[PDB]
């Protein structure tokens, strides 16, 4: 599923991501935008053999199991495919764990290189939340 911006913001908010660990909703939406372009089915192979899955490009070496990432951990205890569902519940729950890991949203390379320090509020402008 390819979410609309305001649609994703609404879902992310309902799921409790707004201000989660101090990150305003705009940060989350911004990250999703540059990580997957709001596409829950987005998958990207990484040089290390792992693969990023879903709307927030959750990695298979640490967070989910895809059956082809040696030395993987599956910290979110979930098949990576669950991170591709139209129902972002799995991605959100997993994301919550990732952001709480210690480096905050810096865990999302796209967020750090394209969202961090910018006016992320712009990502939720016009949305009815």
Coordinates of C-alpha atoms in Angstrom, one line a residue:
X1 CA 0.0 0.0 0.0
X2 CA 1.2 3.5 -1.0
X3 CA 0.0 5.8 1.8
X4 CA -0.9 9.4 1.2
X5 CA 1.0 11.9 3.4
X6 CA -1.9 13.0 5.6
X7 CA -3.2 9.4 5.6
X8 CA 0.1 8.1 6.9
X9 CA 0.4 10.9 9.5
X10 CA -3.1 10.0 10.8
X11 CA -2.2 6.3 11.1
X12 CA 1.1 7.0 12.7
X13 CA -0.6 9.3 15.1
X14 CA -3.3 6.8 16.0
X15 CA -0.5 4.3 16.6
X16 CA 1.1 6.7 19.1
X17 CA 4.2 7.8 17.1
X18 CA 3.5 11.6 17.5
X19 CA 6.1 12.8 20.0
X20 CA 7.2 9.1 20.6
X21 CA 10.5 9.3 22.3
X22 CA 10.4 13.1 21.6
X23 CA 10.1 12.9 17.9
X24 CA 7.2 15.0 16.6
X25 CA 4.9 13.4 14.0
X26 CA 6.5 15.3 11.2
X27 CA 9.8 13.5 11.8
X28 CA 8.2 10.1 11.3
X29 CA 6.3 11.2 8.2
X30 CA 9.5 12.7 6.8
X31 CA 11.4 9.5 7.5
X32 CA 8.8 7.3 5.8
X33 CA 8.8 9.7 2.8
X34 CA 12.5 9.4 2.2
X35 CA 12.9 5.8 3.3
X36 CA 10.1 4.2 1.3
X37 CA 8.2 7.1 -0.3
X38 CA 5.2 6.0 1.7
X39 CA 5.2 2.5 0.1
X40 CA 4.7 -0.3 2.6
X41 CA 5.9 -2.8 0.0
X42 CA 9.3 -1.1 -0.4
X43 CA 12.3 -3.5 -0.1
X44 CA 15.9 -2.7 -0.6
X45 CA 18.9 -5.0 -0.6
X46 CA 21.8 -3.8 1.5
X47 CA 25.5 -4.4 0.8
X48 CA 25.8 -6.5 3.9
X49 CA 23.2 -9.0 2.5
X50 CA 20.4 -7.8 4.7
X51 CA 17.3 -6.1 3.4
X52 CA 15.2 -3.1 4.4
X53 CA 11.5 -3.6 4.6
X54 CA 8.4 -1.5 4.6
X55 CA 7.4 2.1 5.0
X56 CA 10.2 2.7 7.4
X57 CA 12.8 0.5 5.8
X58 CA 13.3 -1.7 8.8
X59 CA 16.4 -3.8 8.4
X60 CA 16.5 -7.6 8.4
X61 CA 19.9 -8.0 10.2
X62 CA 18.4 -6.7 13.4
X63 CA 14.7 -6.3 13.4
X64 CA 12.8 -8.9 11.3
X65 CA 13.5 -12.3 9.8
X66 CA 13.4 -12.8 6.0
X67 CA 15.1 -16.2 6.0
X68 CA 18.1 -15.0 4.0
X69 CA 20.1 -12.7 6.3
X70 CA 22.9 -14.7 8.1
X71 CA 23.5 -13.6 11.7
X72 CA 20.2 -11.8 11.9
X73 CA 18.5 -11.0 15.2
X74 CA 14.7 -10.4 14.6
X75 CA 14.4 -8.1 17.6
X76 CA 10.9 -7.1 16.7
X77 CA 10.1 -10.8 16.5
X78 CA 8.4 -10.7 13.2
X79 CA 8.7 -12.0 9.6
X80 CA 10.0 -9.1 7.5
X81 CA 7.0 -9.6 5.3
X82 CA 4.7 -8.4 8.0
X83 CA 6.5 -5.0 7.6
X84 CA 5.1 -4.9 4.1
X85 CA 1.4 -5.2 5.0
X86 CA -1.1 -2.3 4.3
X87 CA -1.6 -2.4 8.1
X88 CA 1.4 -0.5 9.5
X89 CA 0.8 -1.8 13.0
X90 CA 3.8 -4.1 12.7
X91 CA 6.1 -1.4 11.3
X92 CA 5.0 1.1 14.0
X93 CA 5.6 -1.3 16.9
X94 CA 9.0 -2.2 15.4
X95 CA 9.8 1.4 14.8
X96 CA 9.0 2.2 18.4
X97 CA 11.6 -0.3 19.4
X98 CA 14.2 1.0 16.9
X99 CA 13.9 4.6 18.0
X100 CA 14.2 3.6 21.7
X101 CA 17.5 1.7 20.9
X102 CA 19.8 4.6 21.7
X103 CA 20.6 6.6 18.6
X104 CA 17.1 7.8 18.3
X105 CA 15.9 8.5 14.8
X106 CA 19.5 8.5 13.6
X107 CA 18.8 4.8 13.0
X108 CA 17.1 6.0 9.9
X109 CA 19.8 7.1 7.4
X110 CA 17.2 9.0 5.3
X111 CA 15.9 10.8 8.4
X112 CA 19.4 11.8 9.5
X113 CA 20.5 12.9 6.0
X114 CA 17.3 14.4 4.8
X115 CA 15.0 15.1 7.8
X116 CA 17.1 15.9 10.8
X117 CA 17.5 19.6 11.4
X118 CA 14.9 20.5 8.8
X119 CA 11.4 21.9 9.3
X120 CA 9.8 18.5 9.7
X121 CA 6.5 20.2 10.7
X122 CA 6.1 20.8 7.0
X123 CA 5.4 17.1 6.6
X124 CA 2.1 17.3 8.4
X125 CA 0.9 20.7 7.1
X126 CA -2.6 20.6 5.8
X127 CA -3.3 17.4 7.7
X128 CA -6.3 17.1 10.0
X129 CA -4.9 15.5 13.1

